[PDB]
Design a protein around this ligand. Structure first.
Ligand SMILES: [Cl-]
Ligand SMILES: [Zn+2]
Length: 213
């Protein structure tokens, strides 16, 4: 039975908190059998001394399980949120956009799923390709019955990973929900703190697992 392993309460920094959450998620082979990504929205000074809103998002330099602060690449939120105006973007264009939005271009490339994170207005966001979520969403169960099984969630149909997915995620987000379920892809959870996003992730996946058990 999936367990909830969140033990800490005090962290020195936002990055320490997101690293902690990432490690817990990457430690469960039923949550991360190489993919998944996390993020924290944070305040930083940029090179020009401006205090700015930064999305620190998982990068290509490590898996979630053994991640450290180096594994979080800083993306300007002003830049990322301005992308919401854009209609379509190819994967390639998306990568270029993100590169031009990096607070420090010498950091490792940010997750190709960065826009899932930027476009959800919670401080912490967690994304997995949880096996039990893939199973339940790969059945013929209607989405509404999937939602009744999993809890206070919104369920989205299959959409290929990329910019359109992020736009749909953005638009289906509603105040008060615990998660967004992406059929044939995975799960998004979020919250004001790392624990909130994490607890929501476990509760939903474990409900999925319970149901297919
Ligand atoms: Cl009912
Ligand atoms: Zn994904």
């Amino acid at each position: 039975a999936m367990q909830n392993r969140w033990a800490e309460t005090k962290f020195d920094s936002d990055i320490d908190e997101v690293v902690y959450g990432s490690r817990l998620i990457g430690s469960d082979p039923d949550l991360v059998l190489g993919g998944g990504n996390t993020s924290v929205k944070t305040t930083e000074r940029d090179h020009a001394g401006r205090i700015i809103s930064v999305l620190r998002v998982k990068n290509s330099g490590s898996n979630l399980g053994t991640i450290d602060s180096r594994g979080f690449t800083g993306i300007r939120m002003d830049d990322a949120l301005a992308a919401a105006k854009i209609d379509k973007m190819t994967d390639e264009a998306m990568v270029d956009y993100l590169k031009k939005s990096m607070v420090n271009p010498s950091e490792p490339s940010p997750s190709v799923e960065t826009f899932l994170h930027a476009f959800l207005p919670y401080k912490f966001v967690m994304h997995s390709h949880a096996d039990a979520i893939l199973s339940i969403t790969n059945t013929d169960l209607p989405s509404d019955q999937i939602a009744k099984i999993l809890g206070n969630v919104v369920v989205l149909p299959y959409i290929p990973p990329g910019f359109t997915l992020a736009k749909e995620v953005m638009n289906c987000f509603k105040k008060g929900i615990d998660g967004i379920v992406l059929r044939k892809h995975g799960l998004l959870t979020f919250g004001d703190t790392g624990k909130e996003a994490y607890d929501r992730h476990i509760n939903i996946v474990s409900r999925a697992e319970n149901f297919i058990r």
